[PDB]
Design a protein around this nucleic acid. Structure first.
Ligand SMILES: [Mg+2]
Ligand SMILES: [Mg+2]
Ligand SMILES: [Mg+2]
Ligand SMILES: [Mg+2]
Ligand SMILES: [Mg+2]
Ligand SMILES: [Mg+2]
Ligand SMILES: [Mg+2]
Ligand SMILES: [Mg+2]
Ligand SMILES: [Mg+2]
Ligand SMILES: [Mg+2]
Ligand SMILES: [Mg+2]
Ligand SMILES: [Mg+2]
Ligand SMILES: [Mg+2]
Ligand SMILES: [Mg+2]
Ligand SMILES: [Mg+2]
Ligand SMILES: [Mg+2]
Ligand SMILES: [Mg+2]
Ligand SMILES: [Mg+2]
Ligand SMILES: [Mg+2]
Ligand SMILES: [Mg+2]
Ligand SMILES: [Mg+2]
Ligand SMILES: [Mg+2]
Ligand SMILES: [Mg+2]
Ligand SMILES: [Mg+2]
Ligand SMILES: [Mg+2]
Ligand SMILES: [Mg+2]
Ligand SMILES: [Mg+2]
Ligand SMILES: [Mg+2]
Ligand SMILES: [Mg+2]
Ligand SMILES: [Mg+2]
Ligand SMILES: [Mg+2]
Ligand SMILES: [Mg+2]
Ligand SMILES: [Mg+2]
Ligand SMILES: [Mg+2]
Ligand SMILES: [Mg+2]
Ligand SMILES: [Mg+2]
Ligand SMILES: [Mg+2]
Ligand SMILES: [Mg+2]
Ligand SMILES: [Mg+2]
Ligand SMILES: [Mg+2]
Ligand SMILES: [Mg+2]
Ligand SMILES: [Mg+2]
Ligand SMILES: [Mg+2]
Ligand SMILES: [Mg+2]
Ligand SMILES: [Mg+2]
Ligand SMILES: [Mg+2]
Ligand SMILES: [Mg+2]
Ligand SMILES: [Mg+2]
Ligand SMILES: [Mg+2]
Ligand SMILES: [Mg+2]
Ligand SMILES: [Mg+2]
Ligand SMILES: [Mg+2]
Ligand SMILES: [Mg+2]
Ligand SMILES: [Mg+2]
Ligand SMILES: [Mg+2]
Ligand SMILES: [Mg+2]
Ligand SMILES: [Mg+2]
Ligand SMILES: [Mg+2]
Ligand SMILES: [Mg+2]
Ligand SMILES: [Mg+2]
Ligand SMILES: [Mg+2]
Ligand SMILES: [Mg+2]
Ligand SMILES: [Mg+2]
Ligand SMILES: [Mg+2]
Ligand SMILES: [Mg+2]
Ligand SMILES: [Mg+2]
Ligand SMILES: [Mg+2]
Ligand SMILES: [Mg+2]
Ligand SMILES: [Mg+2]
Ligand SMILES: [Mg+2]
Ligand SMILES: [Mg+2]
Ligand SMILES: [Mg+2]
Ligand SMILES: [Mg+2]
Ligand SMILES: [Mg+2]
Ligand SMILES: [Mg+2]
Ligand SMILES: [Mg+2]
Ligand SMILES: [Mg+2]
Ligand SMILES: [Mg+2]
Ligand SMILES: [Mg+2]
Ligand SMILES: [Mg+2]
Ligand SMILES: [Mg+2]
Ligand SMILES: [Mg+2]
Ligand SMILES: [Mg+2]
Ligand SMILES: [Mg+2]
Ligand SMILES: [Mg+2]
Ligand SMILES: [Mg+2]
Ligand SMILES: [Mg+2]
Ligand SMILES: [Mg+2]
Ligand SMILES: [Mg+2]
Ligand SMILES: [Mg+2]
Ligand SMILES: [Mg+2]
Ligand SMILES: [Mg+2]
Ligand SMILES: [Mg+2]
Length: 248
RNA sequence: CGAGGGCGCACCACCGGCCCGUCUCGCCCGCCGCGCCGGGGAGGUGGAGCACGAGCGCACGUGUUAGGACCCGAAAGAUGGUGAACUAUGCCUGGGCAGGGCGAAGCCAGAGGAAACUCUGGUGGAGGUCCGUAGCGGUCCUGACGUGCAAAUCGGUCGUCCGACCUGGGUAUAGGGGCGAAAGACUAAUCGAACCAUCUAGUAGCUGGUUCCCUCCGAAGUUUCCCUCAGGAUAGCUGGC
RNA sequence: CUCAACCUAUUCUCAAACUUUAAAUGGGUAAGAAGCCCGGCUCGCUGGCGUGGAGCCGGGCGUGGAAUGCGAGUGCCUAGUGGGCCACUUUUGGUAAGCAGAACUGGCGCUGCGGGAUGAACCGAACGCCGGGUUAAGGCGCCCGAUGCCGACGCUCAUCA
RNA sequence: CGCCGCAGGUGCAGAUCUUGGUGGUAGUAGCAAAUAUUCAAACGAGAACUUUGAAGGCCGAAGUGGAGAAGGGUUCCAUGUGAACAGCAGUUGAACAUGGGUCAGUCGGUCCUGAGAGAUGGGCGAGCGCCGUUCCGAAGGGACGGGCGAUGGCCUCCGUU
RNA sequence: CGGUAACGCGACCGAUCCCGGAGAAGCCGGCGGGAGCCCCGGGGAGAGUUCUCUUUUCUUUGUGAAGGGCAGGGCGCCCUGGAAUGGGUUCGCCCCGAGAGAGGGGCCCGUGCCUUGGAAAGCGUCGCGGUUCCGGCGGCGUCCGGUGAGCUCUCGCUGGCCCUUGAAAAUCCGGGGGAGAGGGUGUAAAUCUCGCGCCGGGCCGUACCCAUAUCCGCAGCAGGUCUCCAAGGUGAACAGCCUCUGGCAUGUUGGAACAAUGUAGGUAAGGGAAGUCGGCAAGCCGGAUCCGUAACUUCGGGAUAAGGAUUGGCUCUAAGGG
RNA sequence: CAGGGGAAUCCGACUGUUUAAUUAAAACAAAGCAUCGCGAAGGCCCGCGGCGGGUGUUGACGCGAUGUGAUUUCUGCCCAGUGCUCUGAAUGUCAAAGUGAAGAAAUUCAAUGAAGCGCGGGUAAACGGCGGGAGUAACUAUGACUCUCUUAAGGUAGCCAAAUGCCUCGUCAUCUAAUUAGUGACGCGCAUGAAGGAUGAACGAGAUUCCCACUGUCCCUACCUACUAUCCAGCGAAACCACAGCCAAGGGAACGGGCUUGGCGGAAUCAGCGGGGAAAGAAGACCCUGUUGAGCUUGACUCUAGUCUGGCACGGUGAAG
RNA sequence: AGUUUGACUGGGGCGGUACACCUGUCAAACGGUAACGCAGGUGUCCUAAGGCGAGCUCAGGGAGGACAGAAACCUCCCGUGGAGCAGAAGGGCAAAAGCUCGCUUGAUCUUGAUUUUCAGUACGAAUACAGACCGUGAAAGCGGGGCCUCACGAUCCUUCUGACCUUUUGGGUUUUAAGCAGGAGGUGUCAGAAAAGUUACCACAGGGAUAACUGGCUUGUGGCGGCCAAGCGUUCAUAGCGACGUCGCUUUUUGAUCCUUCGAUGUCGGCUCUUCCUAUCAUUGUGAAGCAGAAUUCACCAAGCGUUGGAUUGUUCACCCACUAAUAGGGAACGUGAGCUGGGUUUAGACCGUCGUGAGACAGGUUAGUUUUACCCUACUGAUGAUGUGUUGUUGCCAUGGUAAUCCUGCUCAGUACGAGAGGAACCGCAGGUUCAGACAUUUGGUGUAUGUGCUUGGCUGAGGAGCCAAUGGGGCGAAGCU
C-alpha cells in the first residue's frame, strides 16, 4: 500500500543528478555555413575531468566566422588528442582522430566517437568512455548511412550526421574491480542517489511486490509483463529469456 | 306482589338479500348508430363492501416509529488544512578528529654468484590498517534508578576512532504521501498511515448509569420464523380500560 | 457300532428399535328445554314408493333429569420476558460428576418467617401494625425457650464409640 | 407563601459520572550523583548559608577559566525591601520596587551568487490558482562617438534638451 | 626614460571591441622559514624562606596599524658557458644538451629586525603633594645572552590518494588593437594609475547569559545544545595524577550517631567453578627493553601468537654535534 | 597509565549499517558474480492538466529493473504447471463502428474479424519441482544392470542427527569419575542439496564446547570504608482508600476480615519485614463472541488509474496496384 | 479502491450436519417431548411401476419325470403369505394393493372447504366434495398420479401459454410495450444476502454466557490396598507370592466438566525457607520367615531425628559417578517472582526445514530480547510502654507458651557364640567423629582507615627536617574490637 522505490524516483526530489560541479554539456559545435561547406579549425586548450562521467572533456576554441570573438566548445575527448592540437570540423575536414565530419563523407569502415542521432543536433551516440560506432554502409540516393552502435544494433541515419573520428578516451574503466563499498559510495556520490541497493525480498510487502514471507523468496515469477503498471513491474521486465546465456 | 303472555334496544350466532371482480349455464330484451353494439337472469366463488350513517375538530394519556432520540462510550470512514525546530535521505556552504604499532609500492648500499639472478641492511610511509583519547555509538552488568536527576538518565565495562567518519547552518522531499545500508524504521515524547479543525451528539444487537412516597395487580426464560444462537418478530404469560 | 446334520417332543436364558395376552396412572365424549314427543309445509337434492334427507311452520310436555363447588360472558390497548436453575419420581448419553439432555408436579428466581448449628431450592408455613391463646416441622443436660417425668423395655464399651 | 388552574431544563448515592472543595495516608516518603570544610570579625532583631580576613581543599588550560554563534529579552548595572518565590535559611538573589545602561565610513547586516526559491511571456485550469525559468516574447529605455537643430548661460566657449 | 636580459624608474594620452588574470578552491604525508609560548644562563626592581643551608625561590623586566630600509624565505626568472671518468641533490625525492654544476644578476613574499610612530604612552618600583573619587607631580628602570625532532599558529617547498578531481557570482586589474584627441615652439595643449591639499560616508544591530541557574526539556531538571585561546611536572601523549593563572564552595538543607537491609568500593586462610542455564560478576594479564614465537594461510597475515628474562637508587665510562 | 591466553564447532567474507525508548544479530549493505529492458517517436518513473516533468549538463564502459552475496571451487536434471517472451501458418472465438438483407419503422438477422485469449516455438543465475513400481550378482543383504507408472524430470556434485533429523538423550569413537552438552565419523536425509552447494585465511561487544591461568561464583561466611537508612531542627508530597483489618473448621458464587460454631480479645507506639489484604498499577494484549475494524495478500466479489487495440474527428494532394 | 469471507458446536479450529425432509426407537399405553441419542433413508425413479376390468397365486418344501447333475424344464401335493408391491423402515394387502393380459391417458380443465407443520401464517404434501370433459367395466362403480407415511421452493426479474380480453396518456390504424390468469428458469444456510485469506504489527466493544493456570465435583486412567485361593514356592495354597474374579481407598497422574475469576489472582523450573502428611528408606522398641551366624524379606507401634556431594539437560522427570545409617514418597493457589533468577514457554528482529500461489503458519529446530511499587492494615520479628497492687525500689513465684539433640565409626567383647567350612555377631564398657544447637576469642586464621609504624611512585611546600595531595595513592607488618 506504499509507493515503492523506483516509483519514487520519477518525482525527482532526492533522486536528481548531482550536477553542481559538472563542467557543462558535452556537445559538438552547432552546424553552420563553415561546417556545412568547408571546415573550421579549432585548437584544443585543455582536457578536463567531468564529475560523474568517465570520459575526459576537451575544451576546444574556434573563431566566430561572423564577429570578432573566440568560441569555446566542450567536445567529448577522443582518445589520442592532446592540448595544442588543431582539430577541424566540417565537410571538407580530413580523416584524423579528433576531427568532426559527416558520416556520408567517410569510408565504409571508419569508426566514430560522438555521433549525431539526427542531422543537426549535437552528438548523441557512442559518448560513454571507450565506446565507438562504426560506419557500415552508404546510400547516396536518399542520403542515408548505416552504422553499428556500441550495443551491436544497426541504425540508419542521415548522411549529414556529424561525428568525431576515433574512440572516446577513458579506456577500459570497467576493468578495475571497485573492491570497496567506499569506492562505490564515492563513485555514485558524483552521479546521483542510487547506490546502496536494498533487495526487494528483504523488504516488507507494503513497499515491494517481492517483500514479505518467512523466508526471503520472491513467491511469484520474477519475469513481469511489459504492460504491468508502475509499482508492479519489478524484476526482469518483459524478459525474452532468462538463465545463463550459453550460446551467444 | 304476580304465573303466564307481548313489543323487542344494543350486541352475538345463524339463514337469506343487494353492490363490484371472476367462473359455469342459459334464454330474452333495446335501437336515429343493427353492431366483433348495449342491457338483463340463474348457480358457485374473490372484496379492506351495503343492509336508515358517525364522523370531523380540539385536548389529554399510553404504545410504536423517524429524527442526536433516555445519558455517556468505540476501533473506524470522509473533507479541508498545518508541520522536515526531532528524526530519514539528497544537495549547498562551513568546522573538526591526542599519542603510539604494523611497515605496501618507490629508492640507496653491501654481500653472494660464471651468469640468470638472489640475499642482507637501510630509506620510504601506503592502508574503508591495528592499540587507544576527543568525538560518535551503545555490548554486558539483564548494575543503579524505576511516584527517577531523567515520560530513556547515571556508573563501570564496552564498539569505532582517515573514513560508507563526526557535526553547525542553509536548502529539497508532506500523509496513502515522503524518506528508509530495510527495523514497518523515521516523519516535533504520536506511525502497520502524523497532527489540526470539521462532517459529528458518527453507529453500537455490547458495558455502565437512569433521581419522591404509599396503595393495588403481577410475570418470563417457552412455541414458530429470522446469516437466528449476547438480538428481534410471533404466540403465550402481565397490567389497564 | 460311533460322531454330525435333519426331524419330533422337551429343557436353560433373553429383547429400546420383538410379541399372543396385558394393567395402574391417563386421553376423548355424554349426563336434556338448542331436549323429547306430536301434526303439517318446502325442495331444483335423492328416488319403485305417501321414498330418504334436510330445512321450515304450529302444538304439547318442567320430577330443570349425577355429586361437589363457584357468578359468568365478551372486546380493546398493552409492558416485561424470550440466558434459567433446583427437588421427589420417570428417564437418555456418560465410569462418574455440584456433568450434559428430556417428562410431570412443586419450588427458587420474585420470598420473608419457624426448624435443618451454618446454607437460593430440604421440612413446616407463606407475610398489613399489635395483644392473648394454640400449634406445625423440630425439639426440651448447659450454651439455648422447654423432661428439675422418682418416664417404660431392651441393646451397646469403642487404646479412630 | 397558601388555595384553584396552567407549564416544565421538576426530586440523585452510585454512571473508573462533571466541576469545586476536603480527609486518612502523614509531620510520613523524602530534601543521599560529581572528595570539604573551619576560625575570627562586620553589618544586622536574627548568621551553618551574606561580606571581609585567615586556613584547608577542588576544577587542573579537552577547566568549575576567558570570549562568541543560535536562543532568551533587560535576566545587565546601582540603590532599596524583606510580603510571596529561590522544595532548609538568608542580612543574599537571575525575586520585588525605583532609576540607569548598548554611541561605528574602516565589527557585522547591507552587496554577490550557491543548493534552491520565484514572477512575467506562454501553457494548463470550473476556479482559488499552478506548470514552467528560457522554454511558444517585438524581452536591449543604455552609450564617451557623429549629425540635425532649439543657444537655455560668465550667449568667447563648453556643459544642457 | 634605463637595462643584453630577467626587468626597473614617480607619473608615462587613448574609446567601442577582443583576450587573459585575480576572486577561485579537495583530503592526507614529510620537511623548512617566521612568530607567540615553554625552557636555560646572567643583570635589575619588588616579594618569600632563613631552626640550619641556599649569591637562593617566586613575580616582573613593551612597542599597534601604515610607511622606509635591511635580513630571511621562495622562484618552472635572466646572462655567460657547455657537462660521461656523469654530475648536482633531498628526510623522501628529484634535476639536467628542451642547458647540469659554477659565476653573476632579476622578481615575489617579507607577519622578522632597525627606523618614523616612540615614550610623551604603558608597566614595575620608590616617594611627595592634593581638586571629598587629579589621564596629579617626581625619581629610577623597562638590560644582555643561549638553546630546540618542544607546543600552537602561519608562510613555503615537495610528494601521495581518487571509476571521488574538490563552487558560483559580484568586484577589481593587466594586455591586444588604435577609432580619436591635443599645440605650432608656446613658459605650450590634450592628458596623468605621481606627491600634497579640500569635502563626505546615511540606515539597522551592538547591554548581558551562552549554561550542573539567563537557551530547550512544565523547573535554578545529573539530559540536550555550534565554536575559538590553552602554562609547569611525570609521561609516548590534548592520557591519568599533582600544581600556577583564573574560578569555585561540593551542586535545592544542616546536626548527632554508626543498627539491620541496601547502593558504591575493598580484603579474605585452605580449596579453585565443586556455584550457575551459562565463569554472569570479579579476578588474572598489562608499559618498555632484550630474546623467542606454532598450526593454518587468499602468502598480505596469524603476531603483542604462545613462552622467558629484565626494570629502583647512586657514582661513573664511552658513543652520537655545531 | 596499562592486552588474560590456547584448541576447536556454527554463521556472516572483511570495514560499514540497523529496530531514538526491551532485539546490534547470523539481519541490511557491500565489492564480486549473473540475469533483464532500452538506440531517444526510447527504457524506467512522476504528473489532475499542458509533447508537462525526473534519470538527463545523460547515450549501452550509460541509465533503469532484479537476484545472489569477497576470494577459491563447482553450480546437475526438468519448459509438463504457472509466468514471461517470439512469428502468425490456412487459422477458432472475439466489442463498438462500418457493410448487406427483411420490415412501415423502431427493430431483427447475416456477412466481415483489432488487440486479447486459444494453437505453435523459446526460456529455470523466471517462479518453482527433482516420487514411485517391478525384475536383476554363486551365503544372505544390496543392486553396477533392464523395463515401467503419474508424467516434465526423477536429487547429480557435495554436505549432515548441521542454526535443517520427528523417532532421538540416533549408533560408534573421543573428551569426564560420571556428559540429554562438545568434537570426529556413519547415513534411505520425518522434511539436506547446488546464485546458491561446499570450502577458506583475516575479522566479530555474534551462538557453542573444552583446557591453562585466575579468582569470595561456591564450600562459608567474616571484617572494613563512603553514602543512606536511623534520631533531631527546618521543610514536606504521592499512590491507594465500600467499611475495615487476629484465627481454625463449616456452609457459601465450590479458597472469609465480617456470617455459623469454636479458639479468644488490653491503650498509644518505634525499627524492620515481605505470608496475606485472591495488595496497587491497566475497562485481559491470551481465548471466544460482535452480522465492530484496520495493516497486508491473492484468479475472493465488484470496480479503477495507467497501458494495448479498433472506430469516428482534426486530416489534406497525387499515383499505382 | 470498496467490501465480504455463514451457522450449529460439551471453548474455538479441524471433523461432522444433529441446517429442509422421511422410518423405527428414545417417549414414561392420547397427542407433544431434548442431546454432535441410537439404527437408517432422501434431492430420485416410473407411458407405466399411472387408470380401469378380467383371470390367476406367491416364498419355500416334498414326491416324480430322456439327456438333466445341488440348481435348466414339465406334473402332482402341502403351503396365512414365511413372497412381491422401485427405494429406507414401519404399517397395509390374497379370486388383494402382488403376477399376466386387454383397453387407456383422472399424471387433464376449474372454484371453493378441510387436514398435517402451525402463530392455527405460508410452502409442500394430503383428505372429502362440487362443476366439466373423459377412461375402463356387462354393471355397481372406480380413477383427477404412484397402497400409506418423504421425494422439495417466496418477492423482483425472465420465458411460455390463454381471452376476436384491458391499457399504451388529444383522437384513429398498425407494430411494440405494459397488464390479468396459469406453468417453468431458484434460492440444499432449503421462510429464500451476491462474497477468499492472513495478522506474532494489530485495534475496539464486550464476555467468566467461553478455553489456557489454581480451586471444587468425579476417579475412567494413574497410584495404593483388601477378599476368594487355581497355582509358584525340591514337598507345602496363604514364610514370601497370587491366576480367574470381585470390593475399596487416594487426589502427588492424566482425563471429564465449565461452578468462581477475562474494568487481569503475574503463567515452567531452579534457588531460598518454614511447616505439615505417612502409604517408614534409615534410626528406637518389637513380632514372623524358606530367621544357624552375617545379610536379607514381611508386618506392628511409630513422622522424634535425618534423607547428601556432583557430570549432562531450562527441565519437572531421567540417567550415571560417588559417598552414606539411609540417600523414602508427598502437600501447603502443581507453597514460595512488591523473595530472586529468567535458562524454558509466550510479543515485536532474524535464520533453516516443512506447509501455503501469497500474505503468512508450525505443542518443529535456533539466536537476541525492559521482570515496576510497600511509607498503609494485618501477620511475624525485635523495641518502648500500658491496666492493677497508694508512690517507688529490691529480691522472687510460676499460669501459660516455646523447647532439642542426632546418628555413625574404631577398640574391647571376639576370630568368641553360631556354622561342616567360608565366614561371623550382640549386651556391658572405652575412645572418638557426623548433622544440629547454644556460646566464645586464650590460641590459629580473616579483617584492619587505631589512617598505628616502616617502605615507596608522581606532584607540592626554595632545600634539609617535617609533612601534605592522588575520592583509602600503593604496598609490608599490625593493637583493640568483630569474627
Ligand atoms: Mg543489495
Ligand atoms: Mg524485515
Ligand atoms: Mg503489494
Ligand atoms: Mg516475498
Ligand atoms: Mg348471511
Ligand atoms: Mg400500538
Ligand atoms: Mg446520545
Ligand atoms: Mg467504509
Ligand atoms: Mg534540520
Ligand atoms: Mg581503521
Ligand atoms: Mg580499531
Ligand atoms: Mg537493570
Ligand atoms: Mg515484520
Ligand atoms: Mg461518540
Ligand atoms: Mg435468511
Ligand atoms: Mg450481558
Ligand atoms: Mg441438568
Ligand atoms: Mg433474574
Ligand atoms: Mg410467584
Ligand atoms: Mg419463600
Ligand atoms: Mg431458619
Ligand atoms: Mg447440618
Ligand atoms: Mg436445639
Ligand atoms: Mg433451659
Ligand atoms: Mg434535569
Ligand atoms: Mg452526589
Ligand atoms: Mg440508584
Ligand atoms: Mg524522614
Ligand atoms: Mg536523604
Ligand atoms: Mg587537584
Ligand atoms: Mg566559559
Ligand atoms: Mg525556602
Ligand atoms: Mg545582577
Ligand atoms: Mg525583575
Ligand atoms: Mg618600536
Ligand atoms: Mg646552474
Ligand atoms: Mg616610562
Ligand atoms: Mg558584548
Ligand atoms: Mg542541567
Ligand atoms: Mg514548553
Ligand atoms: Mg542547580
Ligand atoms: Mg559531597
Ligand atoms: Mg553544602
Ligand atoms: Mg580465598
Ligand atoms: Mg588461597
Ligand atoms: Mg557445575
Ligand atoms: Mg549444581
Ligand atoms: Mg566479564
Ligand atoms: Mg592465536
Ligand atoms: Mg559481519
Ligand atoms: Mg564468504
Ligand atoms: Mg544505530
Ligand atoms: Mg532499542
Ligand atoms: Mg540494545
Ligand atoms: Mg562468490
Ligand atoms: Mg549487487
Ligand atoms: Mg532448458
Ligand atoms: Mg485474434
Ligand atoms: Mg514453495
Ligand atoms: Mg545424496
Ligand atoms: Mg541428516
Ligand atoms: Mg541441532
Ligand atoms: Mg560442561
Ligand atoms: Mg557431529
Ligand atoms: Mg540450478
Ligand atoms: Mg479462616
Ligand atoms: Mg474487557
Ligand atoms: Mg482492552
Ligand atoms: Mg449474529
Ligand atoms: Mg474492512
Ligand atoms: Mg478473480
Ligand atoms: Mg405418557
Ligand atoms: Mg405418546
Ligand atoms: Mg382382480
Ligand atoms: Mg431457514
Ligand atoms: Mg462460568
Ligand atoms: Mg484403577
Ligand atoms: Mg506346588
Ligand atoms: Mg494484581
Ligand atoms: Mg497476588
Ligand atoms: Mg502407620
Ligand atoms: Mg522426603
Ligand atoms: Mg505454583
Ligand atoms: Mg508472593
Ligand atoms: Mg517479578
Ligand atoms: Mg530468554
Ligand atoms: Mg520472536
Ligand atoms: Mg542482545
Ligand atoms: Mg511447659
Ligand atoms: Mg527437635
Ligand atoms: Mg614523594
Ligand atoms: Mg625530606
Ligand atoms: Mg591541593
Amino acid at each position: 500500500g506504499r509507493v515503492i522505490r523506483g516509483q519514487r524516483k520519477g518525482a525527482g526530489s532526492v533522486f536528481r543528478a548531482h550536477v553542481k560541479h559538472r563542467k557543462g554539456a558535452a556537445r559538438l559545435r552547432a552546424v553552420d555555413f563553415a561546417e556545412r561547406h568547408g571546415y573550421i579549425k579549432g585548437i584544443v586548450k585543455d582536457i578536463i575531468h567531468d564529475p560523474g562521467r568517465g570520459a575526459p572533456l576537451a575544451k576546444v576554441v574556434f573563431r566566430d566566422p561572423y564577429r570578432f570573438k573566440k568560441r569555446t566548445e566542450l567536445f567529448i575527448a577522443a582518445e589520442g588528442i592532446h592540448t595544442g592540437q588543431f582539430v577541424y570540423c566540417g565537410k571538407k575536414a580530413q580523416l584524423n582522430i579528433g576531427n568532426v565530419l559527416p558520416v556520408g563523407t567517410m569510408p565504409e569502415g571508419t569508426i566514430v566517437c560522438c555521433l549525431e542521432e539526427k542531422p543537426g543536433d549535437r552528438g548523441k551516440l557512442a559518448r560513454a568512455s571507450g565506446n565507438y560506432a562504426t560506419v557500415i554502409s552508404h546510400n547516396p540516393e536518399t542520403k542515408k548511412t548505416r552504422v553499428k552502435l556500441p550495443s551491436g544494433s544497426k541504425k540508419v541515419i542521415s548522411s549529414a550526421n556529424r561525428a568525431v573520428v576515433g574512440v572516446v578516451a577513458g579506456g577500459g574503466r570497467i576493468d578495475k574491480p571497485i573492491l570497496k563499498a567506499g569506492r562505490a559510495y564515492h563513485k555514485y556520490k558524483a552521479k546521483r542517489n542510487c547506490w546502496p541497493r536494498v533487495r526487494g525480498v528483504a523488504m516488507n510487502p507494503v513497499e515491494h511486490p517481492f517483500g514479505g514471507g518467512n523466508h526471503q523468496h520472491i513467491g511469484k515469477p520474477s519475469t513481469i509483463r511489459r504492460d504491468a503498471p508502475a509499482g508492479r513491474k519489478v524484476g526482469l521486465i518483459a524478459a525474452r529469456r532468462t538463465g545463463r546465456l550459453r550460446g551467444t
